Design a protein around this ligand. Structure first.
Ligand SMILES: *[C@@H]1O[C@H](CO[C@@H]2O[C@@H](C)[C@@H](O)[C@@H](O)[C@@H]2O)[C@@H](O[C@@H]2O[C@H](CO)[C@@H](O[C@@H]3O[C@H](CO)[C@@H](O)[C@H](O)[C@@H]3O)[C@H](O)[C@H]2NC(C)=O)[C@H](O)[C@H]1NC(C)=O
Ligand SMILES: *[C@@H]1O[C@H](CO[C@@H]2O[C@@H](C)[C@@H](O)[C@@H](O)[C@@H]2O)[C@@H](O)[C@H](O)[C@H]1NC(C)=O
Ligand SMILES: *[C@H]1O[C@H](CO)[C@@H](O)[C@H](O)[C@@H]1O
Ligand SMILES: *[C@H]1O[C@H](CO)[C@@H](O)[C@H](O)[C@@H]1O
Ligand SMILES: *[C@H]1O[C@H](CO)[C@@H](O)[C@H](O)[C@@H]1O
Ligand SMILES: *[C@H]1O[C@H](CO)[C@@H](O)[C@H](O)[C@@H]1O
Ligand SMILES: *[C@H]1O[C@H](CO)[C@@H](O)[C@H](O)[C@@H]1O
Ligand SMILES: *[C@H]1O[C@H](CO)[C@@H](O)[C@H](O)[C@@H]1O
Ligand SMILES: *[C@H]1O[C@H](CO)[C@@H](O)[C@H](O)[C@@H]1O
Ligand SMILES: [Ca+2]
Ligand SMILES: [Ca+2]
Ligand SMILES: [Ca+2]
Ligand SMILES: [Ca+2]
Ligand SMILES: [Ca+2]
Ligand SMILES: [Ca+2]
Ligand SMILES: [Ca+2]
Ligand SMILES: [Ca+2]
Ligand SMILES: [Ca+2]
Length: 424
């Protein structure tokens, strides 16, 4: 009868061997034309291996896969031309190769991630799978870059992605975090996943005024409701946290009369004069405005504004001396004829309610019955004789004088001076 060299053969195959790979040849001995056949084998044996009925060579006819089957049991029956038969078994062991990529499973991503999250806030939960065995299935993760995110390993194949750095939406509003996982096989395989992080806003920025303080000039006699300035503050926060409202909180004026002077539009920051300013009553006043955001809690800043009321020429000069008659004339009839040049006949005394050039007075002769007999001090308003009185000079003299300010246009007052020389 036929007989195999032994009952049980053992071979190992790498899962990556191509179809048609030589597994083993088994032969029985007539000591002839013997037939070989599988018997009592699994269905997958018939589907993976080919047994030469005449030669007894065994080859694969399809691809292997350690993840699907780690071993095969092959029973071969040898039949000579007679009825007798013999059997042997071949236990085929499959070897694991690194042919399965690691995969990364990310859940519970903190979306969005508040910018005030404490150190150690759990952003995401990470889990790794690897269908291979042993080292080929041993996966480890790490984060690329140094943007402030660290992987904490709670147990094997489980990670927590945590912050280790204070966040700031105003500096970095979005993050792309790449987590890479690699196995420890030969050669190693790796995969990666990109976690996108949206940093949500917190009201952590107070409004800031565009200027450290405000110096405003407003011409006197302005209409009420005249826009005199516009404050502006900025706030990098989002939405309600960056919405600014302006207001007036303090002033060196009477608190009950503050609204009667100035206001500010709460949305535009335009500052209005609520009344016609009068430089002669008040030259300047101080003001403290506030910019406030609409966050919880609110943030604010304070800025000082000074308003300078500008002088206009709204007052004409007025003569205080000499006293004038209803016709605007004054009489000086005791002027001695022997008066030496420089004799002070009289002095026009005028005042002006304004300031600066608007109240800088100058005195002019408009009409003279004898030009050059009398002089008129341009700035003093002193009326003096300029030359010795002559024999052909009239006893009665008349001057029409004007006191003007230095405004534009110049306002003035006039007076007629009857100067009458007395005979000795
Ligand atoms: C985080 O990453 C995403 C996605 O980026 C994509 O994948 C990466 C691995 C890289 O290969 C990138 O090059 C790739 O875009 C960024 O999203 C943004 O996606 C759009 C989609 O096309 C990118 O292109 C724009 O698409 C519009 C669509 O109409 C075009 O009109 C634009 O002209 C533009 O091309 C966009 O570039 C991309 N932004 C990037 C790469 O910065 C996401 O922005 C990124 N986050 C950060 C903070 O960088
Ligand atoms: C800006 O100033 C505001 C004014 O509030 C009042 O005035 C001052 C003089 C203090 O006495 C203050 O306590 C009063 O309530 C404040 O309300 C506000 O907090 C200030 N903001 C900043 C950023 O300083
Ligand atoms: C192909 O090669 C293998 C090498 O071991 C043999 O075992 C087989 O029988 C066939 O000759
Ligand atoms: C997975 O990603 C790593 C990145 O380090 C590569 O080196 C590797 O070859 C595979 O592409
Ligand atoms: C209101 O309007 C005046 C001009 O009329 C500006 O000067 C002011 O700043 C505010 O915008
Ligand atoms: C005044 O200017 C600030 C910027 O400094 C703006 O935020 C504001 O809207 C106004 O234009
Ligand atoms: C004084 O001067 C002004 C102009 O300077 C006149 O308008 C006024 O009537 C007076 O003569
Ligand atoms: C001075 O003179 C002018 C010109 O006559 C008058 O208008 C004024 O009232 C004052 O008498
Ligand atoms: C001063 O007074 C005389 C009249 O006495 C006027 O003629 C002159 O214009 C000014 O008013
Ligand atoms: Ca496989
Ligand atoms: Ca494998
Ligand atoms: Ca693997
Ligand atoms: Ca911030
Ligand atoms: Ca913010
Ligand atoms: Ca804010
Ligand atoms: Ca005035
Ligand atoms: Ca004035
Ligand atoms: Ca004046």
């Amino acid at each position: 009868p036929p007989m195999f060299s032994q009952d049980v053969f053992s071979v190992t195959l790498r899962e990556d061997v191509p179809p048609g790979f030589s597994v083993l040849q088994v032969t029985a001995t007539d000591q002839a034309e013997i037939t070989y056949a599988f018997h009592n084998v699994d269905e997958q044996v018939e589907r993976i291996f080919n047994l030469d009925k005449r030669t007894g060579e065994i080859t694969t006819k399809d691809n292997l896969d350690f993840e699907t089957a780690k071993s095969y049991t092959l029973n071969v029956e040898a039949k000579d031309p007679g009825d007798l038969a013999s059997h042997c078994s071949i236990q085929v062991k499959i070897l694991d190769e690194n042919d399965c990529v690691p995969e990364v499973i990310v859940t519970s991503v903190f979306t969005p991630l508040p910018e005030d999250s404490p150190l150690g806030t759990v952003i995401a939960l990470i889990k790794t799978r690897d269908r291979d065995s042993g080292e080929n299935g041993d996966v480890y993760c790490h984060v690329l870059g140094n943007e402030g995110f660290v992987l904490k390993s709670s147990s094997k194949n489980y990670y927590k992605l945590v912050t280790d750095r204070t966040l700031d939406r105003e500096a970095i509003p979005e993050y792309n975090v790449t987590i890479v996982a690699a196995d420890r096989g030969k050669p190693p395989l790796s995969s990666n996943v990109i976690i996108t992080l949206h940093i949500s806003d917190v009201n952590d920025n107070a409004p800031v005024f565009h200027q450290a303080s405000y110096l405003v000039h407003v011409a006197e006699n302005n209409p009420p409701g005249t826009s005199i300035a516009q404050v502006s503050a900025s706030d990098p926060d989002l939405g309600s946290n960056g919405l600014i409202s302006y207001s007036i909180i303090a002033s060196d004026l009477e608190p009950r009369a503050l609204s009667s002077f100035v206001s500010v539009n709460q949305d535009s920051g335009v500052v209005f004069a609520q009344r016609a300013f009068d430089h002669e009553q008040l030259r300047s006043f101080q003001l403290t405005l506030q910019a406030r955001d609409h966050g919880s809690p609110t943030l604010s800043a304070n800025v000082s504004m000074r308003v300078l009321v500008g002088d206009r020429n709204d007052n004409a000069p007025r003569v205080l001396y000499p006293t004038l008659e209803p016709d605007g004339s004054a009489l000086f009839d005791m002027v001695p004829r022997a008066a030496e040049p420089g004799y002070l006949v009289t002095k026009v005394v005028a005042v002006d309610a304004d300031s600066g050039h608007n109240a800088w007075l100058s005195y002019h002769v408009l009409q003279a019955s004898d030009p050059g007999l009398f002089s008129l001090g341009l700035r003093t308003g002193e009326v003096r004789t300029a030359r010795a009185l002559g024999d052909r000079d009239s006893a009665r003299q008349r001057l029409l004088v004007a006191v003007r300010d230095g405004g534009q246009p110049p306002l003035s007052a006039t007076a007629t001076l009857h100067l009458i020389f007395a005979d000795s």
